[PDB]
Every structure is written in structure tokens, then in C-alpha cells.
Amino acid sequence: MKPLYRQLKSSHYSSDYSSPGYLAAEAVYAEIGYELDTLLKQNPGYANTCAVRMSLALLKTGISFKGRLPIKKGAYKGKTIEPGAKLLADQLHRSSSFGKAKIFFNAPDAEKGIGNKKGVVFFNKITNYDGGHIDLIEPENSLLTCHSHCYFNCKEVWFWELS
Amino acid sequence: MKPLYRQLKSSHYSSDYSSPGYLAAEAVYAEIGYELDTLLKQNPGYANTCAVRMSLALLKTGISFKGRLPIKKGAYKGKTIEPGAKLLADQLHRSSSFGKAKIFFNAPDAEKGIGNKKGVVFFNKITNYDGGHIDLIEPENSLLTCHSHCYFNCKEVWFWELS
Ligand SMILES: [K+]
Ligand SMILES: [K+]
Ligand SMILES: [K+]
């Protein structure tokens, strides 16, 4: 299936405190049956929660993707999360659900390429930020807004349009 | 013609430790295929990195200018950086894209002249600071802030407004 933007957004926990769809990182992991503090000790990379949040939104809208972190609690117990942003972007890139991303190498090209569309965005190799960022993006007041945060100071912007 | 402020900013590496867009001098030069240590030995002036950073931001927003350091690596290989702040300011001043800067000769006139606008700023002949400083400036909580640092304690402030 191909998820609709509105429903993917409804099913996506934002990390932005002022977002209507906000949920704290600890609560996101608790839902899937993990203690964040425990995971951080195993791999500090778990502090970057964008791909966990996006994985969960995709699962909730019925989208297939390979994952590495088993869900241990709730309706999605047994299903898997991909906690790495790049690895999740790779999955989307090779999927029939989403197809190949449009990839932009500078800010003007990224903004023009996205234009008035909405969908999934992946900011790859962000300046002064570890692990990248995958999120939802849409126009707002003639600018682009991300459900959590945009990171246009990066090496590559990947975009998948949704309806 | 002129680049959009937000896109120029997204394309600009800050030298402010606290900036979300911070990249250290070593990494800046490494991107364009240079070793900072080597350049410093050729000319200690290379320690002032503001014009290299601004040069990169201009290239990434498709703005043409005369430079003197050929890029050896990446998307802009073959094109030049201008490492000198005054010389870069000269190029913008005579360009058809940016046009003539508004030039202020004291700090209060500069503050009032820039006001609540945003764009490119050049601080010429800064007290107790060698090489000048070219940067991005914008209001934040009704106070002007530079992407790296402001230096209003100088002989001349040049300003190009951007949208
Ligand atoms: K955030
Ligand atoms: K996040
Ligand atoms: K050039």
C-alpha cells in the first residue's frame, strides 16, 4: 500500500514540543516495550529517534519495510522497527510503496524540487548533527515545515512525494 | 539574481561553536580539497575563514564571483573561493546579482540602517581583529544576530538586504 500524507502524519510522533502530535522519546520507546535509558547504554545512537518514529508511523499505516528492532509490546508486538535513518531511507528508496527518492545536493534545488508537494524527507549528513533525519515535510505559509524539524544544512536531501 | 536568505544560510558553515550550522576550519578546507595547516604556512591570513565560508555558501546558491583559490574537490571543483573578506565584499559590491552595498561609517548608523532586515553583512576594519568579517545577519527576538559573529566595532559596515 501507499500511505496518505494526512494519515501518516496522524500516526507520526513529533519530537517538537509545540507540535499537536508531540511525544517524548522515552514514551515512544515505552510504547514498543523498551526503556530508553537501557537502549542508550547498548548503543548511544538510539538517542536519534527519527527513524524509530517514522518506522512506527509506517507500520501503523500498513507499510512494509525491513527492520532490526523487534517491538515487544502492543498491537505491533513481533513487528520490527528500523532505528537507523539512512537504513530506513534505503528501504523506502528500494520499495514499490515509495519508489526512488528524488535526491538534491543543495538547498535551492531541494526547496524547488519539493515545491508545493508534501511527503517524506530525509536529510543526509547534516552539519553538526549525528545520524541524519527522516521526517514528514509539507508547505506552510509559502515555506516548508517538517513534523519534527528540518535540517537543510546537510549534504543530501531525499524526497518522496505523498498524496 | 539575489539568493534567498534562508537558502544562503542553509548553505553556510558557521564558525560559532554554539551554532546548529557549525563546522570547524579544518573540515571547511577539507571539503574543497585543502589542508588548513599547509595553507596557514603559505599565508597566516587563512586563519580568518569567514570569506571561504561565505564563498562556499554563494557557490551552493549559484552566485558567481571572482576568486583566487581553485577548488580541488567536490561539486564545485574548478571554481574558485575568495579567502579574503574585503575582496569578496568588493565582488558582491560590483555584482549585478547583489548590487551596491549600503555602507555605514559607524555602529549606531549601521544598527539603524540594518534595523529589522536580514542579509549579508561585512564588517570592515574591526578593532582588535585582523582581516574583517563577512557573514549573514538577521533579527532574532528583535536583536540582530550573525550566523558566526557580529563585529560592529569597526570602521565600516556594508550591508546587502536579502529576502
Ligand atoms: K525537534
Ligand atoms: K526526531
Ligand atoms: K568563484
Author numbering:
A (entry chain A), B (entry chain B): 1 to 163
Show the paper's wording.
Some Gram-negative bacteria target their competitors by exploiting the type VI secretion system to extrude toxic effector proteins. To prevent self-harm, these bacteria also produce highly specific immunity proteins that neutralize these antagonistic effectors. The opportunistic pathogen Serratia marcescens has recently been shown to utilize T6-dependent secretion of two family 4 amidases, Ssp1 and Ssp2, to mediate antibacterial activity. In S. marcescens, the resistance-associated proteins Rap1a and Rap2a neutralize Ssp1 and Ssp2, respectively.
Isomorphous crystal structures of Ssp1 (at 1.85 Å resolution) and the active-site Ssp1-C50A mutant (at 2.2 Å resolution) reveal the overall enzyme structure and details of the active site. The protein is a monomer in solution but crystallized with two molecules in the asymmetric unit, each consisting of residues 1–163. The primary, secondary and tertiary structure of Ssp1 classifies it into the NlpC/P60 cysteine peptidase superfamily. An N-terminal subdomain comprises residues 1–95 and is formed by six α-helices (α1–α6) and, on the surface of the protein, a β-hairpin-like loop (β1, turn, β2). A short peptide segment links α6 to β3, which represents the start of the C-­terminal subdomain. This subdomain is dominated by a four-stranded antiparallel β-sheet with order β3–β7–β4–β5, which is flanked on one side by α7 and β6 and on the other by α6. A disulfide bond is observed between Cys146 at the C-­terminal end of β6 and Cys150 located on the loop linking β6 to β7. A cleft, the substrate-binding site, is created between the subdomains by residues in the α1–α2 and α4–α5 links, the C-terminal segment of β6 and the loop leading to β7. Cys50 donates a hydrogen bond to a water molecule, which in turn interacts with His133, Asn48 and Tyr129. Asp135 accepts a hydrogen bond from His133 and appears to complete a catalytic triad reminiscent of that observed in typical cysteine peptidases. The differences evident from structural comparisons suggest that a distinctive and more open substrate-binding surface in Ssp1 compared with those observed in Tae4 structures or implied in Ssp2 might explain the promiscuous endopeptidase activity of Ssp1.
